[PDB]
């Protein structure tokens with residue numbers, strides 16, 4: 237039958253990288269950048 241099941245309509249997006257939250261995606265990704273490395277790898281694994 238129909239399909240209706242969710243958790244909430246607020247900060248539904250949760251960063252699987254650290255565990256943060258965000259109302260939308262843009263607001264989330266913009267933060268996920270901290271987990272995104274660049275060509276020039278730093279002292280950390282990445």
Ligand SMILES: [Zn+2]
Pocket residue numbers: 251252253254255256267268271
């Ligand atoms: Zn995060």
